[PDB]
């Protein structure tokens, strides 16, 4: 039939998939009212909290037909609020997003008028995007404009965080009492920081009051609708909603149902406080819900079916919240409606032992049934994980819509401990976003933007000149024709890297200050370890752990490029640097013999070939060494991860031909995957190549693999997938995820998209509809190596 295990969830799912993407202007209006009332009369943290509270008090609330869990970010499903305190769109922005080819958002004429007349006049000079851009150096602006790197905080708040367990043990009235206790013990005689603590703690208290009002208003809304509903079954559902909201979020949840509603209210809260990267996620959902599940079934108020029904409702709620609209580079690097709410199922419990429980299997059943691209429902696989759980996950992956990805629990824990987390805290951790490792509920781990490693080699080969933007973007490391050795070339590359990282980090530091001062998040601070105890907002270092990342893109492309140069120019001496540079400038036109050599007669990453893989390691180590351990403004350090989202398309589009044989404006490699056509020795050879990268020293790496549908059939096919995951993870690989599609279906979908509106594929760290992808991205996915066992 229709997807959904029950008639209720079938109906909720059909509403969700039919909702049209559009913008909701109410949030911007209410924030404007609050600033006009309060700006200049209070410190900024209190201003944000008072503005959030004003928004919560006055926004319109809705309950959709059949819901058991309530709460929407916008006016209706697929309605995105706007965030003019971060990015106040131009009228052209609104025109572009309404009319663009993919990832469009409808802008009603009423929304356009209000934005033009009320929002722009107030927020255009206040938006943080202008504070950032106006503070960047000309070197940063040139590099940014040339596609050397991206900037995550230009249109969104740092975000990128995961809920802990606080909201299942405390309500917001409890947290407020904790905050009031902290306020009473501030020592203004001897603690010279007491004033800053008071401002942040006062804001947190106001945020708590706002959450109490959220629950109060939804309970009223539910009862007012109950008096008006004639259908007896619906009225009882409305009365159940009201009873649930009488408890949460003001008080700690007492039941499994209340635990889910508490999480979802907090989710609505933090993602309307600010437009945070990767929305929000409960993280280790099966660990938090299992005590409630066991208690509730034992008391006879819950069974497996109702527990599954509630989670199917939750799944639909995620799918009703798009990532708010992006423009410019932010869209190019994250070209999707999804908001990367990553759920980790399986793994280990807080004591460090096997965490698979009954809720874990329920989550696998609901993600299988619902087949929704939000949330991003993934599994943590431990050496302690039962093989039955892994094989069930492989069963779902083999169906070919991308979810779940697989994460190595032992790698995650060691990555966290390498970064300074205690073993006790690391056992609560996991991955969020695409593949990013973090200590859930206790860490600010902020991604700052992608770094175009292949184009750094391009700058090296052009003495700092960018052949595409036709500007001097890098530094003068020398004419490559004078390099007498591969070591000399690699040293020049490392100098270009150092310069580009220095440029990025300097801008990052400015941006970190701007976000801390102008984007404090008192609501998020209330639920993140150490903010209350420290009296310090999450956005300026209140978390127990603080890290920042620069995301490395294109390791396969640059590995094969430097490998091609070492092999052909310096070792075998089949041609010289001058000839290679002419070939690149001509996009290999007139140099077909060179193209054949570098493409087809040269070692390649992903074949368990140490000639290429040792170069991968050298590049990886240089990147790790250049970035890791640099201080952040708010008391943490920089670390390294490797993922592209859709930025590998953009980074290749503004790059010329590269020495490995990739042609001008083609995408660079995705994640740590091999280059196009690079791996010719099967999937075991590539996981052996990928394992030579030291995953433990990163905050996560992304590996895509693709299988022919015929080679994963039957029980042997499941075992082959399961065994590949185990083999990779036994070598301490971080992550792997699978495409399993018929190439001809994708090709047909390109010719007749309207017949394939349901076709979903794996992109990079998330799944999306094939029809939401540009032709270039579609062709990138189709070109990935079709593996056989």
Author numbering: 1 to 789
How is this structure described in the published paper?
Elucidating the activities of uncharacterized enzymes present in the human gut microbiome can enhance our understanding of this microbial community. trans-4-Hydroxy-L-proline (Hyp) dehydratase (HypD) is a newly discovered glycyl radical enzyme (GRE) that catalyzes the transformation of Hyp to (S)-Δ1-pyrroline-5-carboxylate (P5C) and water. All GREs use a glycine-centered radical cofactor for catalysis. In agreement with all characterized GREs, HypD is dimeric with each monomer consisting of two five-stranded half β-barrels, anti-parallel to one another and surrounded by α-helices. The Gly loop contains the conserved Gly residue (Gly765 in HypD) and is part of the C-terminal glycyl radical domain that is found in all GREs whereas the neighboring Cys loop contains the catalytic Cys434.
During model refinement, we observed electron density resembling glycerol in the active site. Although we believe that glycerol binding is an artifact (glycerol was used as a cryoprotectant), it is not surprising that glycerol is able to bind given HypD’s high sequence similarity to GD. Strikingly, the D339N HypD variant also lacked Hyp dehydration activity. The lack of activity in this variant is particularly surprising because of its distance from the HypD active site (6.3 Å in the Hyp-bound structure, Figure 4A; 7 Å in the glycerol-bound structure, Figure 2—figure supplement 1B).
